[PDB]
Amino acid sequence: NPESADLRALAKHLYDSYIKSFPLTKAKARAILTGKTTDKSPFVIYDMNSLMMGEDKIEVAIRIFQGCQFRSVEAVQEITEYAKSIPGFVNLDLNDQVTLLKYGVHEIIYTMLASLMNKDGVLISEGQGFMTREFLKSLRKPFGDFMEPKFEFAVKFNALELDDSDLAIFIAVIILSGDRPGLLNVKPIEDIQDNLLQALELQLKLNHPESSQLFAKLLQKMTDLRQIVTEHVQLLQVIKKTETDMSLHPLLQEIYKDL
Amino acid sequence: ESADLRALAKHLYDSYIKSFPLTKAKARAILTGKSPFVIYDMNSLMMGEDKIKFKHITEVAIRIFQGCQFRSVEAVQEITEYAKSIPGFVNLDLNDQVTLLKYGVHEIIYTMLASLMNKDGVLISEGQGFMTREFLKSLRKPFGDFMEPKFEFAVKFNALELDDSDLAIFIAVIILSGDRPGLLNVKPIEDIQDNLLQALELQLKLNHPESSQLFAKLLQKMTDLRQIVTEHVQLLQVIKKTETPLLQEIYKDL
Ligand SMILES: C#CCOc1ccc(/C=C2\SC(=S)NC2=O)cc1
Ligand SMILES: C#CCOc1ccc(/C=C2\SC(=S)NC2=O)cc1
């Protein structure tokens, strides 16, 4: 194990800072969704009466949507915290840091949203709740189509059966993309990712020694992420016209602006 | 048992060299002779941004201030990597690691900032530049009173004439402070620090035999450090009442 030991140390570092940056890991999500407890069982929201009942322990479609955005802002904060811990990220040009976050934040958000999802719904409110897929689809349709692409991607992506130690390196690879529009110094970004991609390859080979070409399949999923992000920005462009009274968050505004 | 303390001292020094590019020996060679670009007024600041490379290059006083905090973010990552090298640190509770770092990064940032400072100014941009103390004082209020406390601390601290091998163990001692608010398991933290304090005592007695109680005086500097940190966050909230997106999330601390 020559220089593979450096990649193992990098994997462990990213995983340690992953746990320190995201309070709801995939491990805790799967322990809740399956039923490995009686204290971690979520309250299930599936209709109007179960929503009103679940509003004790933390318009209707507007309220759910605003709740989504706030969770998204919090997620951007956590991803920012995690990004600062990627070796070399804070040593890059400041403009490039803003750019990498601006275009990577949502690909990671949907990637990690898969961890909170099954084919039937998605965990909410730090895992205290669980909103069903059909209830989200039953919302008034501009809002009813917002979560279905995330659910379809999550079904296909959860089949890879990645744990948190894999996802830490994977989302690090997403942040350090040298093909982002408007980057000033691409070469250093590509060097960091070259290291992150090596680390991810080794981690997937050791953690999934039977998953043939899991590295390639995981890399191919980034295509689906792009498509998901595109459909979302279009959907937002519809909501901005239909709902002239709803407010989009400034942080979310700066991310999607001129994307 | 002293051989174990010496092994810990050498280990922490090698990790210190690996983690911090601009060491105190490097900085002091620059502050004596080896050729940094000097920033002494507004015009030399303009020419500095056009010739070197920085992190403050993106009112002038507000810009200088932000470059203090960006560098602090960069510094936090270097300090984080070094802390992970302290024996026993990674085996601690994860929440305790986050807490120790959260409350230690400031004291360490100023401790090591003293290594880049003399009575006349501070090195910047990995030693490529040197911003004068007078030009920092000439900044408009409240930004002109931001760095002067750090300079006054660095003078008294540098009078101790510590080197990198001393500062490595000293920083490690700061991290393992068992009195940080919110710690869940103080016992192993204080155990590691008890070992680090022994290593620091032996190091100072072997490296500065003419200084009788240098260990005691170095410990006395921590009160001055916590005053500098405590009084720094005050000017930081007043700074939050004088500066009104995605960039502000990157610098959510410092
Ligand atoms: C249309 C639409 C979007 O659907 C969603 C999906 C997930 C959430 C997550 C929540 S809500 C809450 S409270 N805490 C969370 O994490 C909210 C709305
Ligand atoms: C009032 C005020 C703030 O004064 C300072 C002091 C030090 C720095 C450090 C820098 S800036 C750079 S680039 N590289 C460094 O190490 C920046 C601003």
Side-chain angles (χ1 to χ4, degrees), chain A residues 2-35 37-56 59-140 142-239 241-243 245-256 259, chain B residues 1-33 35-49 54-55 58 60-140 142-209 211-238 242 245-250 252-253:
Chain A
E3 249 159 72
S4 57
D6 278 321
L7 305 169
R8 295 312 297 166
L10 179 58
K12 178 262 167 197
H13 167 91
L14 290 176
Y15 181 52
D16 172 83
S17 43
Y18 175 95
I19 300 182
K20 292 172 174 175
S21 299
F22 308 108
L24 183 49
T25 61
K26 181 173 186 179
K28 180 169 179 174
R30 296 309 156 183
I32 292 172
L33 285 173
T34 54
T37 17
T38 47
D39 41 305
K40 304 180 176 56
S41 275
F43 186 89
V44 174
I45 298 173
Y46 64 100
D47 75 325
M48 241 51 152
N49 283 16
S50 61
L51 175 74
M52 173 186 180
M53 195 94 60
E55 285 196 333
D56 335 338
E59 209 222 87
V60 42
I62 304 297
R63 265 151 53 196
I64 302 178
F65 194 83
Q66 304 285 17
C68 163
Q69 290 198 56
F70 157 75
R71 173 56 201 153
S72 277
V73 176
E74 206 171 22
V76 172
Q77 302 171 347
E78 300 164 4
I79 295 171
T80 300
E81 222 187 271
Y82 178 72
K84 289 158 71 177
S85 73
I86 304 178
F89 177 82
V90 298
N91 306 118
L92 301 174
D93 191 309
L94 191 49
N95 308 119
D96 293 341
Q97 298 183 19
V98 172
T99 299
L100 296 182
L101 293 177
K102 182 195 203 302
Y103 284 90
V105 115
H106 280 293
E107 301 174 356
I108 301 178
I109 273 179
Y110 300 139
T111 294
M112 306 187 66
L113 182 63
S115 296
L116 317 179
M117 286 179 158
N118 56 30
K119 70 198 210 307
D120 297 317
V122 53
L123 292 175
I124 60 175
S125 189
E126 286 232 47
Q128 296 175 279
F130 174 85
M131 196 167 297
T132 63
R133 177 177 180 176
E134 289 279 29
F135 173 71
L136 285 162
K137 186 63 197 75
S138 66
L139 274 14
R140 65 155 248 255
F143 293 105
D145 323 335
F146 257 87
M147 291 296 290
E148 275 300 277
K150 288 84 180 179
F151 276 113
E152 294 165 350
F153 168 84
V155 164
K156 293 257 74 178
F157 182 88
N158 289 357
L160 303 188
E161 296 191 276
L162 305 184
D163 59 35
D164 296 284
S165 63
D166 312 319
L167 294 169
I169 316 180
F170 177 58
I171 69 176
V173 166
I174 292 183
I175 295 180
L176 276 296
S177 288
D179 280 330
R180 305 304 194 178
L183 290 173
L184 300 182
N185 313 333
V186 173
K187 179 68 166 57
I189 302 169
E190 287 188 343
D191 295 6
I192 298 178
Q193 192 192 244
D194 196 304
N195 213 23
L196 297 168
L197 285 166
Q198 255 178 306
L200 175 63
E201 185 177 24
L202 185 50
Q203 162 75 11
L204 294 177
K205 280 180 169 54
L206 301 177
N207 198 21
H208 309 261
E210 320 294 339
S211 232
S212 188
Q213 289 287 149
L214 181 59
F215 186 60
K217 292 151 174 167
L218 177 55
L219 294 181
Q220 288 186 111
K221 255 51 184 172
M222 286 183 286
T223 309
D224 311 275
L225 284 173
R226 287 279 227 275
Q227 308 280 67
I228 283 326
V229 174
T230 297
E231 295 181 359
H232 189 88
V233 311
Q234 297 177 11
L235 267 162
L236 263 37
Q237 290 176 350
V238 178
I239 310 287
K241 321 295 268 300
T242 47
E243 316 297 296
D245 63 329
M246 191 195 320
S247 59
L248 172 62
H249 194 277
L251 184 61
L252 267 43
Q253 282 205 30
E254 177 62 30
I255 289 168
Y256 285 119
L259 215 55
Chain B
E1 191 202 305
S2 292
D4 285 325
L5 300 180
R6 296 314 301 162
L8 174 62
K10 170 129 195 61
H11 172 78
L12 293 177
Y13 175 69
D14 299 341
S15 303
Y16 178 97
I17 293 298
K18 170 86 262 300
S19 295
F20 304 110
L22 188 48
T23 65
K24 189 193 182 178
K26 276 239 57 181
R28 217 112 293 255
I30 298 175
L31 292 167
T32 53
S35 180
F37 184 86
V38 183
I39 299 177
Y40 53 91
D41 73 328
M42 302 294 176
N43 247 323
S44 52
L45 191 276
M46 214 180 156
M47 187 181 181
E49 295 185 61
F54 297 87
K55 90 187 317 153
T58 287
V60 178
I62 288 90
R63 198 153 64 258
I64 300 181
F65 182 79
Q66 329 270 64
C68 174
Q69 305 295 64
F70 293 97
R71 216 288 120 179
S72 287
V73 172
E74 201 180 20
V76 166
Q77 289 316 307
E78 296 176 343
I79 297 164
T80 299
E81 183 201 304
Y82 174 71
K84 288 192 176 185
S85 64
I86 303 175
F89 181 87
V90 300
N91 299 330
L92 297 175
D93 183 285
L94 301 166
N95 303 113
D96 284 352
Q97 301 182 34
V98 171
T99 295
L100 293 180
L101 288 178
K102 175 200 174 189
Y103 289 94
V105 285
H106 285 76
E107 299 166 359
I108 300 164
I109 274 169
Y110 298 150
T111 289
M112 310 191 68
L113 186 62
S115 291
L116 317 178
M117 292 193 278
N118 57 33
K119 65 181 230 300
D120 296 290
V122 52
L123 295 176
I124 61 176
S125 178
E126 297 109 14
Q128 291 175 341
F130 174 81
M131 182 164 287
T132 68
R133 181 179 183 177
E134 282 298 314
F135 177 65
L136 288 170
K137 300 181 64 174
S138 66
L139 298 193
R140 78 164 206 267
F143 298 102
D145 311 273
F146 176 79
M147 288 304 301
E148 264 303 88
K150 326 295 183 235
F151 279 109
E152 298 169 17
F153 167 81
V155 166
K156 317 198 301 179
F157 188 78
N158 287 335
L160 300 192
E161 298 177 4
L162 298 180
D163 58 41
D164 295 290
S165 57
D166 307 329
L167 289 169
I169 317 177
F170 176 61
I171 290 165
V173 167
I174 295 182
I175 300 178
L176 278 304
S177 301
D179 56 321
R180 306 306 190 181
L183 291 174
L184 299 164
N185 191 6
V186 177
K187 194 215 171 286
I189 298 176
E190 288 199 339
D191 292 338
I192 298 173
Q193 195 197 38
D194 187 295
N195 224 98
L196 292 175
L197 279 170
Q198 289 191 6
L200 179 63
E201 184 174 8
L202 186 62
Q203 161 72 8
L204 292 181
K205 296 202 179 191
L206 296 175
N207 193 32
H208 305 267
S211 64
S212 43
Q213 292 284 304
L214 176 59
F215 181 64
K217 287 169 283 193
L218 180 53
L219 296 177
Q220 289 182 297
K221 293 298 171 302
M222 291 281 324
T223 94
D224 292 11
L225 276 168
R226 296 210 175 176
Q227 293 206 343
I228 297 304
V229 178
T230 285
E231 182 200 316
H232 176 259
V233 307
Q234 321 257 27
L235 196 87
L236 240 53
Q237 59 124 346
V238 183
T242 191
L246 196 55
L247 201 276
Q248 316 194 347
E249 285 295 340
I250 300 179
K252 65 180 184 67
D253 263 270

